[PDB]
Design a protein around this ligand. Structure first.
Ligand code: HEM
Ligand SMILES: *[C@@H]1O[C@H](CO)[C@@H](O[C@@H]2O[C@H](CO)[C@@H](O)[C@H](O)[C@H]2NC(C)=O)[C@H](O)[C@H]1NC(C)=O
Ligand SMILES: *[C@@H]1O[C@H](CO)[C@@H](O)[C@H](O)[C@H]1NC(C)=O
Ligand SMILES: *[C@@H]1O[C@H](CO)[C@@H](O)[C@H](O)[C@H]1NC(C)=O
Ligand SMILES: *[C@@H]1O[C@H](CO)[C@@H](O)[C@H](O)[C@H]1NC(C)=O
Ligand SMILES: O=N[O-]
Ligand SMILES: [Ca+2]
Ligand code: NA
Ligand code: NA
Length: 595
């Protein structure tokens, strides 16, 4: 590094070296370096940051500053020319359920968050950014190109605030700026429990010694729990329907209500903790609240790791799974567990897997009611459609029986995200997630497409003809090179996602390498990885081996018809069985005769 020891929140970290449980922060996982993978630290840099000043200024900031002798294109122009499409017909993934998309977003939220600069206080600064489109300090607005329809309806820009960074802010260091990871790098259910002590405590039911998570007191789903409401104002979930007045959920991760299927899977996970905490209390009436909370927590962390490494990563990485994530050979304390800055963009492949609609299905997997299918844009920050329109069950059936979107070089990101995104504090369904992704690549100082190709041992196309061959597409390579005059300048998010998918996978060679390395490291560099000797007993592991998403549904909803392989495209009733035919988590090996 340029100057080490610039980590302000490094201290106040006590390591009980015999504790059988993870910290909330992720401190004390690595014994020799105890901050490694802990929250509220710098994202790791796999390659030096690239900024137009070599330190923090993002490419695209200064009109008269080139990248490699060319102007970088406007993020929104890249979005309009390359990313957008009109026809949703034929865009669905014939072999991935909608759950495939949704598990991706859940795993992402466990691993990484780079919060926008902390400028919540009411200020003319928001006005200078949103109203006047003035680029300065944290405001780095997404300017509309000529002939952008949004010019006619929304003004000259979309507001965009720079990501927060480590080390004091105005006293910025002379090392290049590093954005923060606000959650734990470990795959540890931090999205359920939180990554900070305050929130972890607020989420818990301390009113009784049962090791329960707090549940909603104002609303229930046929006797099953909802998460508590976030009772701080203003609330974006209230803002999208001021008649319903249904706030956002409060969970371990601040983004839990961003869309209704994310809030859905959070509700399943919360329910599973309290189900585990109740069953643990029955098997061990002696155990106190703290031990019931910790033991349920450790079980839920192991469930998330198994679904992710056994069911999810193999059908993302396809042929490349074995090359980057070979069979576990145990905990390696030399491995860096930190999430990389580049991974936070590589894992944004899910955005091209989001389809244009969400469905509510009844017990026969037929349309639930007469508004059963809803445009996705109406479901950002939407809790009221869960609380007041049928609970979780209909949305869970949609997750099983509907398909993910397939990424397509011609049809990359649905207009529901590309033109109609709602951002809290922006009060309009008018934002562009693709343009935001590209602006954020530049904000975070990302090296370009060919730097990452090099990193991954892959060819670095220099010509139109070279880029055609790597993308296997003539027209997409021409459109990219018309905006970015050299492949060296292509932003990693659009470059990575433009590559044709590997055999049996859903990402191309570059993303398979960036994702594969990151997931290898979070497994190998985790002292509390479930399969690491000593973390669980052998008998605990033979039990954990039989977890499944279908089982999580069976145990936490009144859905009684599930598929055996919940990530593949499943149709009702042919691919569906009764819950009785799905393996159970045998909790008999957590029976502690402790006398
Ligand atoms: C309807 C579904 C989804 C919505 C509405 C959504 C929305 C967003 C938004 C608004 C951001 C922040 C953009 C920024 O300011 O830079 C974001 C970031 C991100 N999204 Fe998505 N997304 C969705 C699905 C997914 C999926 C399916 C995945 C993965 C499979 C994913 C992975 C990510 C990641 C990794 C980030 C960066 C998180 C970080 O800060 O470290 N998203 N998403
Ligand atoms: C705001 O949410 C309300 C409250 O759920 C929605 O209305 C319910 O929805 C329809 C009427 O449009 C009926 O099926 C229910 O009987 C309504 N209940 C109440 C209290 O009115 C309303 O549609 C939502 N509005 C918007 C603009 O999203
Ligand atoms: C906490 O647990 C008690 C006893 O089980 C229950 O009655 C109460 O509603 C719970 N509180 C919250 C906020 O979840
Ligand atoms: C542990 O990780 C280091 C880091 O590069 C690696 O070189 C080494 O071979 C690994 N050893 C074991 C036994 O896992
Ligand atoms: C569908 O995907 C699964 C993995 O989820 C795979 O084993 C199966 O062969 C695929 N089926 C088809 C028809 O492509
Ligand atoms: O999940 N996005 O805020
Ligand atoms: Ca985590
Ligand atoms: Na809090
Ligand atoms: Na969000």
């Amino acid at each position: 590094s340029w100057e080490v020891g610039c980590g302000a929140p490094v201290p106040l970290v006590k390591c009980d070296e015999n504790s059988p449980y993870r910290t909330i922060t992720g401190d004390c996982n690595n014994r020799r370096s105890p901050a490694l993978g802990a929250a509220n630290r710098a994202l790791a840099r796999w390659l030096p940051a690239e900024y137009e000043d070599g330190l923090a200024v993002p490419f695209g900031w200064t009109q008269r500053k080139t990248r490699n002798g060319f102007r970088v294109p406007l993020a929104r122009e890249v979005s309009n020319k390359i990313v957008g499409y009109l026809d949703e017909e034929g865009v669905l993934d014939q072999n991935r359920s909608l759950l495939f998309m949704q598990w991706g977003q859940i795993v992402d939220h466990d691993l990484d968050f780079a919060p926008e600069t902390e400028l919540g206080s009411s200020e003319h600064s928001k006005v200078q950014c949103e109203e006047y489109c003035i680029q300065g300090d944290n405001c780095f607005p997404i300017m509309f190109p000529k002939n952008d329809p949004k010019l006619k309806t929304q003004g000259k820009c979309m507001p965009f605030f720079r990501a927060g960074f480590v080390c004091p802010t105005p006293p910025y260091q002379s090392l290049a700026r590093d954005q923060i990871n606000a959650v734990t790098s470990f795959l540890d259910a931090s999205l359920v429990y939180g990554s900070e002590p305050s929130l972890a405590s607020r989420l818990r039911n301390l009113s009784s010694p049962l090791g329960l998570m707090a549940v909603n007191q104002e609303a229930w789903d046929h006797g099953l729990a909802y998460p508590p409401f976030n009772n701080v104002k203003p609330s974006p979930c209230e803002f999208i329907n001021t008649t319903a007045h249904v706030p956002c959920f409060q969970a371990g991760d601040s983004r839990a209500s961003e869309q209704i299927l994310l809030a859905t899977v959070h509700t399943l996970l919360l329910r599973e903790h309290n189900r585990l905490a109740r069953e643990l209390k029955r098997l061990n009436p002696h155990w106190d609240g703290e031990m019931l909370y910790q033991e349920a927590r450790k079980i839920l962390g192991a469930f998330i790791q198994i679904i992710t490494f056994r069911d999810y990563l193999p059908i993302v990485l396809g042929s490349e799974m074995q090359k980057w994530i070979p069979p576990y050979q145990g905990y390696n304390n030399s491995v860096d567990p930190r999430i990389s800055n580049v991974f936070t963009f590589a894992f944004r492949f899910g955005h091209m897997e989001v389809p244009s609609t969400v469905s509510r299905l009844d017990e026969n997997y037929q349309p639930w009611g007469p508004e059963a299918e809803l445009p996705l844009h109406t479901l950002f920050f939407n809790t009221w459609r869960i609380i007041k329109d049928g609970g979780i069950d209909p949305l869970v059936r949609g997750l099983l029986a509907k398909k993910s979107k397939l990424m397509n070089q011609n049809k990359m990101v649905t207009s529901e995200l590309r033109n109609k995104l709602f951002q809290p504090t922006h009060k309009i369904h008018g934002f562009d997630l693709a343009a935001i992704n590209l602006q954020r690549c530049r904000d975070h100082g990302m090296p370009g497409y060919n730097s990452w190709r090099g990193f991954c041992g892959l060819s670095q196309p220099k010509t139109l003809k070279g880029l055609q061959a790597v993308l296997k597409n003539k027209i997409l390579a021409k459109k990219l090179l018309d905006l970015y005059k050299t492949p060296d300048n292509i932003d990693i998010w659009i470059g990575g996602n433009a590559e044709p998918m590997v055999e049996r996978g859903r990402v191309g060679p570059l993303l398979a390498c960036l994702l594969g390395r990151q997931f290898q490291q979070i497994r190998d560099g985790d002292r509390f990885w479930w399969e690491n000797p000593g973390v669980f007993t052998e008998k605990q592991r033979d039990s954990l081996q039989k977890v499944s998403f279908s089982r999580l549904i069976c145990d936490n909803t009144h859905v009684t018809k599930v598929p055996l392989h919940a990530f593949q495209a499943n149709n009702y009733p042919h691919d569906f069985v009764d819950c009785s035919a799905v393996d159970k988590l045998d909790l008999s090996p957590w029976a502690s005769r402790e006398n």
